Design a protein around this ligand. Sequence first.
Ligand SMILES: Cc1ncc(C[n+]2csc(CCOP(=O)(O)O)c2C)c(N)n1
Ligand SMILES: Cc1ncc(C[n+]2csc(CCOP(=O)(O)O)c2C)c(N)n1
Lengths: 256, 256
Amino acid sequence: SSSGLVPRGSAMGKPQPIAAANWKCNGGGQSLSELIDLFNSTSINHDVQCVVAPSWYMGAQAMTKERLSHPKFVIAAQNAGNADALASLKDFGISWIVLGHSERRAYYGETNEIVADKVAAAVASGFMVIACIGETLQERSSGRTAVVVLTQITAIAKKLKKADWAKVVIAYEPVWAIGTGKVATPQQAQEAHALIRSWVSSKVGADVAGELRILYGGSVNGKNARTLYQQRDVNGFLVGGASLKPEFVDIIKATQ
Amino acid sequence: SSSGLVPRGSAMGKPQPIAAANWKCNGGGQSLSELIDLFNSTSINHDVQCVVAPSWYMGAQAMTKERLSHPKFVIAAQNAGNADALASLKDFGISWIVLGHSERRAYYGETNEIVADKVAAAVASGFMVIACIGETLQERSSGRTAVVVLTQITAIAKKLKKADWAKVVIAYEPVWAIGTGKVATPQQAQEAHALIRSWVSSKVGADVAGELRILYGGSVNGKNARTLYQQRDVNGFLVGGASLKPEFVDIIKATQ
Ligand SMILES: Cc1ncc(C[n+]2csc(CCOP(=O)(O)O)c2C)c(N)n1
Ligand SMILES: Cc1ncc(C[n+]2csc(CCOP(=O)(O)O)c2C)c(N)n1
């Protein structure tokens, strides 16, 4: 009861996009300062939630908490943590967390149970959690992706009640795309994201599933972001390498 | 009752050196493979325990567990973890862990209590733990080092019984030396290490204190390692950047 005079122009839809930067690996306290100068000097007119994930390493989070002021940016913790670690995070007004592969993989092989526990402990303390799931290249080559991907989100979901999903973001980031220059095709991304959503729709709720954001991560850059975002089931990006460059702004723009 | 015919030639002494490589930041599954080819092809004749800490990231730990065979090398986990994470580590025959700054600092400011808990949980599952302590540049400039350093190890110690120290290694790595090219002078290192040992001697036992290894970490490379190791209270090195280069071999040799 709220369309125009004429059909369409689209079947979506689409929750609000996120564009997340993970600065886990950078030792340039200076250029980072400059980056967030760029970010601040940057007019983002559409509805997108931008996230920056600094390390303690070098300037990093201290610099960011101080010098980043843009209204569409929040700061997230990387991993985290103990119950003390969460209590500490609250104290410093950090309310987002990125969880995923380190956690699943740090301890020599698929500890999804740890991912699930961490996501839930976090949601339980009121955090927004970006949860990452993805196959390895081996699992991809052997056509195990669908099984692996579902296994991972089933784990995360087991520890959550329907209402927790309000605070959950999913990042689909295949391990073979991380730092490798091998990004998923828009068709791959769409496929996996669609799979994930169909799972959430069925097992949690269609209500929840349409509101859920599933970000794509893995070798996203200025070039490939738009075509990727075009996909029906992509709601933004988890970005590592290119997040440390002025092109992150372009990754953000692609999210419109 | 076991000297030669003639005094000296030294007042030490000195427990067995460690030379630890932390590969937290490297995306070159190929060159790493080559590195450990170099490490394997490398004859280390003296008593030194070499440690390599791979990430899950890229090839990394999978590659290392497979391809590293040298008898004087063990593999350590980076951080870790949950009780599941430790249980997982045991399963894969990983028996060493590096804990420190991420842990103390990940959650926006000095969570030493987390470091202590983690070190003890680890020692309790039978792990060798390399525990890192260090001031920030601010704390250094303002002459707060002694207070900060002691605060940190006092925390670690609180959760340990005298016999746990058998499994504890201390890494003194000032945060201002990490990835910054600003390494401690041999005199700084000696000072801090000496402080730490005097603390352990007094509060834990002189017995324990002389057997304890305190490694120096922070911008160690082929050039500076020897002069550093020469110091009475330095028992080796925690090495990040230069550990990813053929010069790590030289850092190892310096430990003789
Ligand atoms: C707790 C935790 N720590 C780290 C990670 C890994 N990680 C998070 S951001 C990013 C995306 C960009 O890579 P690229 O350089 O290709 O843009 C990667 C692959 C995780 N999933 N969970
Ligand atoms: C759990 C945990 N994760 C990470 C760290 C940091 N970190 C460990 S190895 C290394 C030494 C070489 O730096 P450089 O590049 O100067 O040789 C640094 C500074 C810690 N203390 N605890």
